[PDB]
Amino acid sequence: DLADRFAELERRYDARLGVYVPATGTTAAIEYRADERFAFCSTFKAPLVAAVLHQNPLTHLDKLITYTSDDIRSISPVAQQHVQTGMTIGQLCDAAIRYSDGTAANLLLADLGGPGGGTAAFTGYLRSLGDTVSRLDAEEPELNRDPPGDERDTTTPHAIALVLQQLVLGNALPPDKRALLTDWMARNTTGAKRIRAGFPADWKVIDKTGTGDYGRANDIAVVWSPTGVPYVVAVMSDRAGGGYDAEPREALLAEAATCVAGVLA
Numbered sequence: 713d714l715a716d717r718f719a720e721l722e723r724r725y726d727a728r729l730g731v732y733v734p735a736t737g738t739t740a741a742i743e744y745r746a747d748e749r750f751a752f753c754s755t756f757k758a759p760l761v762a763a764v765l766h767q768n769p770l771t772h773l774d775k776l777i778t779y780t781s782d783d784i785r786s787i788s789p790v791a792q793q794h795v796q797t798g799m800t801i802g803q804l805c806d807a808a809i810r811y812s813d814g815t816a817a818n819l820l821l822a823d824l825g826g827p828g829g830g831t832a833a834f835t836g837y838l839r840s841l842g843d844t845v846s847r848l849d850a851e852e853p854e855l856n857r858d859p860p861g862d863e864r865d866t867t868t869p870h871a872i873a874l875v876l877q878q879l880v881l882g883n884a885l886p887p888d889k890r891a892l893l894t895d896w897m898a899r900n901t902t903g904a905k906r907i908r909a910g911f912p913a914d915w916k917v918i919d920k921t922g923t924g925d926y927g928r929a930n931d932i933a934v935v936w937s938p939t940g941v942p943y944v945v946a947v948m949s950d951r952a953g954g955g956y957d958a959e960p961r962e963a964l965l966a967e968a969a970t971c972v973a974g975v976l977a
């Protein structure tokens with residue numbers, strides 16, 4: 713019984729866990745707290761890259777963006793290496809997805825442009841995909857810091873799974889732009905201990921992680937069975953009971969993903 717297993721994990725990790733897998737052909741939707749709000753943390757960077765791709769000719773990827781010391785305000789493993797030379801939009805998309813680079817995401821928000829440093833256009837992009845739930849209100853680092861229960865900078869496992877499904881499996885993007893997004897997520901370096909850890913090696917996994925204060929740990933993925941049947945898997949968690957400094961616990965996500973993988977196999 714999945715719901716019992718997920719409740720057990722909540723008790724084990726003193727956590728709140730949300731899980732959504734959209735219905736398919738012959739699988740029912742899997743849902744646990746799936747309509748509860750959880751902080752996006754860095755999972756917003758997947759739809760952000762989609763927004764930027766959609767908004768511009770493909771060769772906008774080649775535009776050089778320059779930035780400086782006062783632009784580095786959050787974990788930025790790539791942008792910190794590159795501050796002296798600048799980064800192209802393509803490099804920024806790569807870093808935002810594959811290293812979950814915060815400065816890259818801030819610069820991409822600015823590229824999208826408009827009110828709230830790009831957060832309003834980002835939210836507008838989600839609305840165009842029929843997501844009337846999610847909202848982005850701040851950039852890095854503030855978007856990870858909203859107190860438990862606060863709706864700012866939140867999505868739900870349900871809302872984000874339906875968004876990701878459109879982006880990767882559906883027709884939200886033209887095939888060329890879709891492939892760019894899928895490949896970046898395929899090559900993610902931050903997800904080995906999350907949804908990836910719950911699925912057997914012969915299943916393909918592409919994903920974007922999120923980690924934040926109050927013990928926040930998220931992962932959104934598309935997985936393909938060894939016969940090429942795709943499923944979207946959104947797992948979100950927090951450990952608000954430990955306060956602001958509560959440690960995120962990836963193991964929770966690995967276990968929840970293992971439970972999902974068992975139903976889908």
Ligand SMILES: *C(=O)[C@@H]([C@@H]1N=C(C(=O)O)[C@@H](S[C@@H]2CN[C@H](C(=O)N(C)C)C2)[C@@H]1C)[C@@H](C)O
Pocket residue numbers: 753754755786787789811812813814817852853856902920921922923924
């Ligand atoms: C987004 O959630 C935030 C960043 N996203 C992270 C993630 O998805 O895991 C981490 S960065 C990632 C894990 N640690 C590695 C690292 O190189 N350092 C921590 C230095 C890579 C991060 C909280 C947001 C700040 O963009």
